Amino acid sequence: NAQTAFWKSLLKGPPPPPNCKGHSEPCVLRTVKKAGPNCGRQFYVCARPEGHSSNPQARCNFFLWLT
C-alpha cells in the first residue's frame, strides 16, 4: 500500500504549537519587531490576556524561541 501512503505524508502540516505549563493550551507565535540582532526572530508565549499576578486565568510565563 505504498503509493497511497506516499502522498498522505505530504498532507501533514508543521507540528502544533507547544502548550504552556500554566494552562496547557496552545501558545501563540509572536515576532520581534525591535530592529537589531533579534529582528524578525520568532517565539512562543502563553495566549491568555494579561492580568493580575493573583489571576490564574491571566497569561503565564511560557517562553520558547522558535528554531
- Rounded to whole angstroms, the Cα distance separating 15 from 41 reads 18
Q: Find the part of the chain contacting Zn ion (CB under 5 A) among 1-9, 12-20, 28-36, 37-45.
A: 12-20
Q: Which of 19, 23, 43, 64 binds Zn ion (CB under 5 A)?
A: 23
**Cα angle, residue 21 at apex, residues 19 and 23 outer, rounded to 5°:** 80
The residue at minimum Cβ distance from Zn ion is 46
Instruction: Report yes or no: 63 and 30 within 8 Å, Cβ to Cβ.
Output: no
Q: Which of 2, 16, 19, 20 binds Zn ion (CB under 5 A)?
A: 20
Does 17 engage in binding with Zn ion (CB under 5 A)? no
